[PDB]
Amino acid sequence: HPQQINDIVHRTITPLIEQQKIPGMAVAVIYQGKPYYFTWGYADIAKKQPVTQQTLFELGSVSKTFTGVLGGDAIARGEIKLSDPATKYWPELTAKQWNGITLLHLATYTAGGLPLQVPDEVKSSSDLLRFYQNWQPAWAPGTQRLYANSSIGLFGALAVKPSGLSFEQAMQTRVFQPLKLNHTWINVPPPEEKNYAWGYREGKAVHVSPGALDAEAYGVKSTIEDMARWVRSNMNPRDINDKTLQQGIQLAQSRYWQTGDMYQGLGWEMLDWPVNPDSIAAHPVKAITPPTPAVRASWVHKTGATGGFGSYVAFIPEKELGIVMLANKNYPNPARVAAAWQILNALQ
| Annotated binding-site members for AMP | 61, 118, 120, 147, 305
Q: Return the residue of 56, 271, 280, 305 that touches ligand AMP, per CB under 6 A.
A: 305
Length of the chain: 348
* Nearest approach, Cβ of residue 250 and ligand AMP (Å): 24
CA 200 vs. chain centroid, Å, equals 21
Q: Examine the residue annotation and report whether 125 is marked as an active-site residue of this protein.
A: no
Q: Distance between CA atoms of 333 and 16, rounded to whole angstroms? A: 12
Complex with ligand AMP: residue 60 or 291, whichever CB lies closer:
60
Helices (DSSP H) in the chain: which residue ranges? 3-20, 63-77, 103-107, 125-134, 149-159, 167-171, 214-217, 224-235, 243-252, 333-347
Please tell me which residue in 61, 63, 150, 163 is annotated as part of the active site. 61
Report yes or no: 328 and 43 within 8 Å, Cβ to Cβ.
yes
Q: Is 149 in the site for ligand AMP (CB under 6 A)?
A: yes
Strands 49-50 and 34-44: antiparallel
* Nearest approach, Cβ of residue 122 and ligand AMP (Å): 9
Complex with ligand AMP: residue 118 or 313, whichever CB lies closer:
118
* Nearest approach, Cβ of residue 60 and ligand AMP (Å): 4
Report yes or no: 28 and 231 within 8 Å, Cβ to Cβ.
yes
Look at residue 173 and give its three-state secondary structure: helix
Q: Distance between CA atoms of 65 and 62, rounded to whole angstroms? A: 6
Q: Return the residue of 20, 55, 61, 144 that touches ligand AMP, per CB under 6 A.
A: 61
Q: Is 310 in the site for ligand AMP (CB under 6 A)?
A: no
Site string for ligand AMP, 215-234 (x = CB under 6 A): ---x----------------
Q: Is 117 in the site for ligand AMP (CB under 6 A)?
A: yes
Complex with ligand AMP: residue 100 or 307, whichever CB lies closer:
307
* Nearest approach, Cβ of residue 59 and ligand AMP (Å): 8
Q: Is 304 in the site for ligand AMP (CB under 6 A)?
A: yes
Q: Is the dihedral of CA 321, 326, 330, 335 positive or negative?
A: negative
Stretch that binds ligand AMP, among 18-26, 42-50, 115-123, 135-143 (CB under 6 A): 115-123
Q: How many residues bind ligand AMP (CB under 6 A)?
A: 13
Query: Phi, psi (5° rounding) for residue 156?
Result: -60, -40
Residue nearest to ligand AMP (CB): 61
If phi > 0 it is left, if psi is from -120 to 50 it is alpha, else beta; for residue 148 that is beta
Stretch that binds ligand AMP, among 1-9, 187-195, 254-262, 298-306 (CB under 6 A): 298-306
* Nearest approach, Cβ of residue 224 and ligand AMP (Å): 18
Complex with ligand AMP: residue 117 or 345, whichever CB lies closer:
117
Q: Is the dihedral of CA 234, 71, 301, 19 positive or negative?
A: negative
Write out the catalytic residue numbers.
61
